[PDB]
Design a protein around this ligand. Structure first.
Ligand SMILES: CC(=O)N[C@@H]1[C@@H](O)[C@H](O)[C@@H](CO)O[C@H]1O
Ligand SMILES: *[C@@H]1O[C@H](CO)[C@@H](O)[C@H](O)[C@H]1NC(C)=O
Lengths: 439, 49
C-alpha cells in the first residue's frame, strides 16, 4: 500500500498521520523531524590572508649613482636618493659627503601563515537538502536518513520511504559568501584582481599554495633619516587582519528562521520553512484485517478537567467495551486537537485515560478508535504561564474558533428585524397593488 | 500555586478555605487563630516613686 502526506517543516514536533485501508485495521504513524540539512554549492572564488613585506638590504653607494631595474614581482617598488651621509657605530660609512647615493626597493609576498589561517570567498548559489526522520513503526522508534529533494528513496524494515522535495526553495545563504575558520558571512567581496587597500580582498590568492598572487598596497618609499642607514617604507596597512576586527555579526544570528550553520562541510540546519511531502509504501504484513482487531462497544467519554496549553494539558477518560484483548489505534480527526498517544491495548468492559493538547477554549471533538467514533465535550481554562521554552506547534488554532457559551450569545445576537421590515414592505406594496399593477 | 483569602479577626473559631486548582483535586484547609499580639511603641517619658 502507498500513502502520501505532507507535514510542516518543523523540528521536534511529533506529527500523527492516519493511514487507513479498507479490509484492515487503520493505523496511525508518528513522524518526527530530527534535523534537516541544506548543503549549498561550493565554487571557491579565491582566498586571502595577511601579507609579508620583503625589503632586502638597501644598496648604498659613494661617488657614483645607482639605477632602478624593473622587477616582475607583485607591487614591486624602488626609489633612489642622493646626498645621504649615513653613520654607523664606528663612524661614517664613507667619505663622499654628498656625491653618494642610496637605492632602495621592496615587494610584498604571501605569508606561510596562510597555509594555516586564511579567509576563503566562495560563490555558492544553489543547495541540496538532507534530513533525518524518526518513525513509530510496529511499536518502536526507527531512524531514517535521506535527501529531502523528492528523489532519494530509502528501504527500512520492508517499507519504502520517499521524502521531499522541499516546498520552499528559500535559503539563508547568498550567491557570494566569505568563510573564516568556523564562521560564515554574507558579504559581496570585491572582484579578483581589484582589491581595495585596507579592505577585505586587499590581497588575492587563487589557492593557499599557488605561488602567483595579486596585490595593491601603494608601496611608496621615503628619503631615509639623515645621518642614519636604514630603509623607510610606506607599506599599506593590511586590510585583511583589520576585517577580522570589524567582522560583525555572524550569519548564525542574522539568518531568518535561525538555520544553524556548520562548516566542513558548510550546512544550514534546523530552520522551519515550508513543508515536506512524504510517500510511504508499506507492505501489507504490518496491515491487520479488521476481523483480527477486537471489536469495540459501549463508548462513553468524560473530561474531569482540561487546560489548553503548549503541553498535553488535556486529560480524557473513556469507558469502552471490547470483544477481546488486543491492540487498537487511536486518533483525532480534527486538526484543532492532537493526541500524544498512538494506540492502546483494550481488554473489554474497562476504561482508559488519554493525554491530549488543544487550543480551543471549549474542546468539542470526536475521537476515533477501532473504527468507531466517540464525542468529547469540555471547557478548558487558561494556564498561568505566558511563555515556555520547549517548542510545541501541535495546538494550532485558526481564525475560526469556538465562542463556547458566548457562541449562543452571538447566535442570539444574530436575530434581526429584517424579516419584519420585509413583511411591512410587502404589505404596503400589495395594499398599493390595488393601484400598482406592474411598474 | 498562590491562593489569597481573608478571615475575620477572631480567635478559637476554625475557618475553612477551599483552594481549587484545575487539573488537580481541590483541597480545603482549616486555619485557626491561636492568638494575636499587638506590641506598642515604648518611649519612656519618665518614672516616679
Ligand atoms: C589542524 C586542525 O585541527 N584544523 C585545520 C586543518 O584541518 C586544516 O588543514 C589547516 C589548514 O589547511 O588548518 C587547521
Ligand atoms: C520513542 O521516543 C519517545 C520519546 O520520549 C520515548 O518516550 C519512547 O520510549 C521511544 N520508544 C518507543 C516509543 O518505542
Amino acid at each position: 500500500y502507498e500513502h502520501v502526506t505532507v507535514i510542516p517543516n518543523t523540528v521536534g514536533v511529533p506529527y500523527k498521520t492516519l493511514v487507513n485501508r479498507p479490509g484492515y485495521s487503520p493505523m496511525v504513524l508518528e513522524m518526527e523531524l530530527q534535523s534537516v540539512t541544506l548543503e549549498p554549492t561550493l565554487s571557491l572564488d579565491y582566498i586571502t590572508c595577511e601579507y609579508k613585506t620583503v625589503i632586502p638590504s638597501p644598496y648604498v653607494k659613494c661617488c657614483g649613482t645607482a639605477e632602478c631595474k624593473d622587477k616582475s614581482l607583485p607591487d614591486y617598488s624602488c626609489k633612489v636618493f642622493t646626498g645621504v651621509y649615513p653613520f654607523m657605530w664606528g663612524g661614517a660609512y664613507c667619505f663622499c659627503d654628498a656625491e653618494n647615493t642610496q637605492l632602495s626597493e621592496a615587494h610584498v609576498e604571501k605569508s606561510e601563515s596562510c597555509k594555516t589561517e586564511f579567509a576563503s570567498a566562495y560563490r555558492a548559489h544553489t543547495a541540496s537538502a538532507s534530513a533525518k526522520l524518526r518513525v513509530l513503526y510496529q511499536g518502536n522508534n526507527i531512524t531514517v536518513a535521506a535527501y529531502a529533494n523528492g528523489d532519494h528513496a530509502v528501504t527500512v524494515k520492508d517499507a519504502k520511504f520517499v521524502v521531499g522535495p522541499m516546498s520552499s526553495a528559500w535559503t539563508p545563504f547568498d550567491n557570494k559568501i566569505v568563510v573564516y575558520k568556523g564562521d560564515v558571512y554574507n558579504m559581496d567581496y570585491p572582484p579578483f584582481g581589484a582589491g581595495r587597500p585596507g579592505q577585505f580582498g586587499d590581497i588575492q590568492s587563487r589557492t593557499p599554495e599557488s605561488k602567483d598572487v595579486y596585490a595593491n598596497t601603494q608601496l611608496v618609499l621615503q628619503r631615509p633619516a639623515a645621518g642614519t642607514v636604514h630603509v623607510p617604507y610606506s607599506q599599506a596597512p593590511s586590510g585583511f587582519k583589520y576585517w577580522l576586527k570589524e567582522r560583525g555579526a555572524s550569519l548564525q544570528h542574522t539568518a531568518p528562521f535561525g538555520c544553524q550553520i556548520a562548516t566542513n562541510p558548510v550546512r544550514a540546519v534546523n530552520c522551519a520553512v515550508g513543508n515536506i511531502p512524504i510517500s510511504i509504501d508499506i507492505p501489507d504484513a504490518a496491515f491487520t484485517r479488521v476481523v483480527d482487531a477486537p471489536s469495540v462497544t459501549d463508548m462513553s467519554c468524560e473530561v474531569p478537567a482540561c487546560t489548553h496549553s503548549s503541553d498535553f494539558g488535556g486529560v480524557a477518560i473513556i469507558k469502552y467495551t471490547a470483544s477481546k484483548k488486543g491492540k487498537c489505534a487511536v486518533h483525532s480527526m480534527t486538526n484543532a486537537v492532537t493526541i500524544r498517544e498512538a494506540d492502546v491495548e483494550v481488554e473489554g468492559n474497562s476504561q482508559l485515560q488519554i493525554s491530549f493538547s488543544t487550543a480551543l477554549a471549549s474542546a468539542e471533538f470526536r475521537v476515533q478508535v477501532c473504527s468507531t467514533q466517540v464525542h468529547c465535550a469540555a471547557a478548558c481554562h487558561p494556564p498561568k504561564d505566558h511563555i515556555v521554552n520547549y517548542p510545541a506547534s501541535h495546538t494550532t488554532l485558526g481564525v475560526q474558533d469556538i465562542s463556547t457559551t458566548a457562541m449562543s450569545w452571538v447566535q442570539k445576537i444574530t436575530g434581526g428585524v429584517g424579516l419584519i421590515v420585509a413583511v411591512a414592505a410587502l404589505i404596503l406594496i400589495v395594499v398599493l397593488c390595488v393601484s400598482f399593477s406592474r411598474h
